Amino acid sequence: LHKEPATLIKAIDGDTVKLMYKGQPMTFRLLKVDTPETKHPKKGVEKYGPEASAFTKKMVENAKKIEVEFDKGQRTDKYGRGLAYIYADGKMVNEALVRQGLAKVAYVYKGNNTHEQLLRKAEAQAKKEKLNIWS
C-alpha cells in the first residue's frame, strides 16, 4: 500500500475528515474504526462521542503532513467518502483513536483488511487499560 499526500480542509467527526486530495476536496471515512455518535437522530450523542471527535480534530489540525493510504479493497463508501487509513506526521489516526479507547475496530469485509492485526493490537491494549469506552 502507499501513502499519498493531502491537505486538511476540515475535521468533521471522530471518524471522518475532509481533505484536499489530488487537488480536489474529498471527504474521508477512517477505515476500520467505529467511534461513538455525536450527531444522531436516534440516541443523539453517545458517551465518548465528543471526545473521539476532539481527538481526531486535534490530531489532524496539529499535523504538519497529512497522508491518505487506501487499502486493497473498495475505496469509497455509499455516501461517497473515500475509505482509507489517515496519517498525521507519519502516525495513523485510525490506530491512535483505537489505542486511546476512543473507537472500536470494525469488521467491514470489502477487501480492506491490511491493518486488522495492528488495530486489534491497539484495541486489546486500550481494553486491558480499561480506557475511555472500555472503562
From Swiss-Prot:
Ca(2+) binds at residues 15, 34-35. Transmembrane segments: none annotated. Residues 115-131 have a biased composition (Basic and acidic residues). The active site is at 29, 37, 81. It is found in: Secreted. It comes from the Bacteria. Residues 115-135 are annotated as: Disordered. This is Nuclease A. It comes from Staphylococcus aureus. The gene is nuc. The chain holds residues 89 to 223 of 231 of the full protein.
